[PDB]
Each structure stands twice: as C-alpha cells, then as structure tokens.
C-alpha cells in the first residue's frame, strides 16, 4: 500500500541509511511522476539524494519540484538545497578523491551556489536557513576571490602584467572586502612597477599602506 511504503521509507530514512531509503522513495516516484501524492516524496527524494552523494539526481529532483510547485511554503528549503548541492559539488573532493585546496578549480559551481544563496537571503531573510546561507555566501565569496588571485599569481609568474592589473582591478570591483584582494594588491603594485607607470604603483602602495591584511 502507498502509506505502508511511505512509512517504511521514513523508518529507513531516520533509523537506517539514505541508500536503503532512495529505492523505497523511487518506488513511490515511479508510479506517480506526475501522479498524486508525489510532492512530499520528491522533497524526501531530494534530501535522500543529497545525503547519498547523488548531487546531479538531487539537482534534477529540485528542478522538477520547482517547476511542479512554483509557489510553496517550504520554497526556502528548496532554494537552500540548490545552493547546498552546488556547494557540495564545489569541494569536489568527494566519492574517494580529495584536493589540497580547490580554490583554483572551476568556480562555476561556486558562482551558482552564491547566486542561489543570495537569491534566498534577499527573497526570504526570515527563514531558519538565512544565517547558514549568509555564512556560505561569505565562504563562496572568499573562494571566488581566491580563484581570481590564483589567476593573478599565474599571470604574475608568466609576466602578463596587463592581465595581472586587469585581474586585480576585477577583484577590487567585485570582491573589495575579501582577504584575497589584499593578497592580490602586492601583485598589482609589482605589475605596474614592471611597466613604465610609477604613479599607479604609488597609488597601490597608498592603498596597501592605508590598510592591508
């Protein structure tokens, strides 16, 4: 019976493990993709996928759910879960692999996570997930600024001084408050000093002298 299947899915989800609960939730979803009583099963399936490392399946379930329900009372949880799946895709040290720092790696997932957490905080600031979303936005902004700093460090090592000043200018425009922009201000001063402009190097030295850390 479907009520028996939902109760065994909830007991396997709470007492057991998410792997044993995905198959039980999938048994409800296969009968009712567009069928009735399929909306709480989709939210249970989204949590079960996220906790099972099935991040593309969790994102596909979230996309199905936000198309089937454009407005719902728990839409804040769905918006938090998209940024949370993208944050778990960044840090792709998952499934048996790890990396020492992953700031250098593709920031596309981190940008999607930052966009979803911001859209949640400016849409629903009264949710229980607002403080965690704001902390994840601070960490994601530090990760994006560290990526643009790693790109500025490479171009400094290669000798691409116009690329280095254009990168540090992009970092000052987009991430003025991050530690990586302070780390990058020396690179912008060095890149101007390697060129025939010392007035810009004096301006960057004045910015560093005013406050850098």
């Amino acid at each position: 019976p479907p009520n028996e299947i939902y109760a065994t899915a909830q007991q396997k989800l709470q007492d057991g493990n998410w792997r044993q609960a995905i198959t039980q939730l999938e048994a409800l979803d296969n009968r009712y993709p567009f069928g009735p009583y399929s909306q709480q099963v989709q939210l249970d399936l989204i949590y079960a996928y996220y906790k099972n490392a099935d991040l593309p399946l969790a994102q596909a379930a979230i996309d199905r759910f936000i198309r089937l329900n454009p407005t719902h009372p728990n839409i804040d949880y769905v918006m938090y879960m998209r940024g949370l799946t993208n944050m778990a895709l960044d840090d792709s040290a998952l499934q048996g692999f790890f990396g020492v720092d992953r700031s250098d790696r593709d920031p596309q997932h981190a940008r999607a996570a930052f966009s979803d957490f911001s859209k949640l905080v400016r849409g629903y600031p009264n949710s229980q997930y607002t403080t965690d979303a704001t902390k994840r936005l601070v960490f994601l902004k530090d990760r994006l600024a560290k990526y643009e700093y790693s790109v500025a460090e490479y171009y400094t090592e290669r000798g691409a001084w116009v690329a280095v000043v254009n990168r540090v200018e992009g970092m000052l425009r987009d991430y003025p408050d991050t530690q990586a922009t302070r780390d990058a201000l020396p690179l912008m001063e060095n890149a101007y000093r390697q060129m025939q402009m010392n007035a810009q190097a004096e301006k960057v030295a004045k910015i560093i002298a005013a406050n850098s850390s």
Partner: protein, 57 residues
C-alpha cells in the same frame, strides 16, 4: 564527504574568513564596486554551530 547530519561536503556555514572593507587613501578613491557578489545583511534566526536541521519538509 560526511554522510551524517553534517555536510555532504565540508563545513562552509562554520568555517569562513571575516570580511573587512579597504580604506580609501586621501587624493584618490577605490575602484567603484559594481559586482553582483554583494552579501546582504542577515537578520533571521541563527542556525550556526553543530546543529544543522536540514530534514525534508
């Protein structure tokens, strides 16, 4: 990574760096900040710490 109440990846709602604005030295200004990566102020319920209540509604 962790498959318990803690994150499927690693902690980003606890681990972070404080953000501090740069001062504008006299006789010049900092680059105009027109990025879309602005962080809105938080005024909701705190959920930070070991507790992370992410059970599906």
């Amino acid at each position: 990574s962790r498959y318990k109440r803690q994150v499927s990846g690693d902690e980003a709602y606890l681990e972070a760096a404080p953000l501090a604005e740069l001062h504008a030295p006299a006789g010049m200004i900092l680059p105009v900040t027109s990025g879309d990566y602005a962080i809105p102020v938080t005024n909701g319920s705190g959920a930070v710490g070991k507790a992370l209540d992410i059970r599906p509604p």
